[PDB]
Write a protein that binds this ligand. Structure first.
Ligand SMILES: *[C@@H]1O[C@H](CO)[C@@H](O)[C@H](O)[C@H]1NC(C)=O
Length: 375
């Protein structure tokens, strides 16, 4: 509907979960915009790091500009204050050691700019991050950033070398990395090269992990025309696979459904079954700019002439938003485990997976896998 009312599903009535649903819904919008731009390539995305940079920035923004941002983050549908106080919490929860997610955001400003401490104060408190002011020296500024996303990602992300843009006003950076563990490991001796249908005309061989007697939560959505399965990870997390029925690169109907609320129903409507599971080994990375995506996400106003007078007196505008993500999984797990039910779940064709946090329900990672072999 779109109007302000009180929450019903007890899950979203919790403030931190409510905030996670908004930020996550922003993630889904971004994914949909980006998937539309990359019709033939894998899409790896960890929206949280980017959503956090926007929300942090919105601190030194004024009414009109702030709203533009708040509306893209679904905050205007949250009838609760201390939205930043809650964000501090959410972050504390999903970045905890037990999870295996490392997510960081950074606001970078143009050379010689002077930032009002009234802005730095709220920012460092709620988001635990200080703004970096560019040096002007191209080689020195790029070193700084790389060392930053290095100390942050504990050196699990490829040190970039794209050379910061000549023209920079405000730069937002969102980096994230993930290497987790299933509650049940896979037999490394059961992993073999198998056929992966890239599409109806092309096939390739990628190493596939296997478990002929896997216990996962399953469900078939007749409308979307796909098979949904959920595998748990240690640290109270899960991965949801959306496997279409026929081989295809067209996953639109499905993508169009991805929302926080939709995922909550699927999570509960799922039934535990036993299945023959084969999932490809995955090790992916992505380093790009999502500025063009945000531009057609009702966020153009920020690249034009926004009002950030709460940050500085000089007119500054959102110039670029960069994202660096690294995702990976394999056999590593925690431990192991009349009349049955048949069930095949073979991920040997284009699919979409969603790494979600079980406690808050926050979207930690999303990917459209057209080719396991990676970029
Ligand atoms: C994707 O498949 C659906 C269902 O067959 C179809 O309606 C849609 O047109 C396809 N995507 C296109 C045509 O861009």
């Amino acid at each position: 509907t779109g109007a302000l009312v009180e929450e019903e599903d007890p899950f979203f009535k919790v403030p931190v979960n409510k905030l996670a649903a908004a930020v996550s819904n922003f993630g889904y919008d971004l994914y949909r915009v980006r998937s539309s731009m990359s019709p033939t390539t894998n899409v790896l995305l960890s929206p949280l790091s980017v959503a956090t940079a926007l929300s942090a920035l919105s601190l030194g923004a004024d009414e009109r500009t702030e709203s533009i941002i708040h509306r893209a983050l679904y905050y205007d549908l949250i009838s609760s204050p201390d939205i930043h106080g809650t964000y501090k919490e959410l972050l504390d929860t999903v970045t905890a050691p037990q999870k295996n997610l490392k997510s960081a955001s950074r606001i970078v400003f143009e050379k010689k700019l002077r930032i009002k401490s009234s802005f730095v104060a709220p920012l460092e408190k709620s988001y635990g991050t200080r703004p970096r002011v560019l040096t002007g020296n191209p080689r020195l500024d790029l070193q700084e950033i790389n060392n930053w996303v290095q100390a942050q990602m504990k050196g699990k992300l490829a040190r970039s070398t794209k050379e910061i843009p000549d023209e920079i006003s405000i730069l937002l950076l969102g980096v994230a990395h993930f290497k987790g563990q299933w509650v049940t490991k896979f037999d490394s001796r059961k992993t073999s090269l198998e056929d992966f249908y890239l599409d109806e005309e092309r096939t390739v061989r990628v190493p596939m992990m296997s478990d002929p007697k896997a216990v996962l939560r399953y469900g078939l959505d007749s409308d979307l025309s796909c098979k949904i399965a959920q595998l748990p990870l240690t640290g109270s997390m899960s991965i949801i696979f959306f496997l279409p029925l026929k081989v295809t690169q067209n996953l639109t109907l499905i993508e169009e459904s991805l929302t926080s609320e939709f995922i909550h129903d699927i999570d509960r409507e799922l039934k535990t079954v036993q299945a023959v599971l084969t999932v490809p080994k995955l090790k992916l990375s992505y380093e790009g700019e999502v500025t063009k995506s945000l531009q057609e996400m009702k966020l153009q106003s920020l690249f034009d002439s926004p009002d950030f007078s709460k940050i500085t007196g000089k007119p500054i505008k959102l110039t670029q938003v960069e994202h660096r993500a690294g995702f990976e999984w394999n056999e590593d797990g925690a431990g192991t485990t009349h009349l049955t039910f048949p069930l095949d779940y073979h991920l040997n064709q284009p699919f979409i997976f969603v790494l979600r946090d079980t406690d808050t329900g926050a979207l930690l990672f999303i990917g459209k896998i057209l080719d396991p072999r990676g970029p």
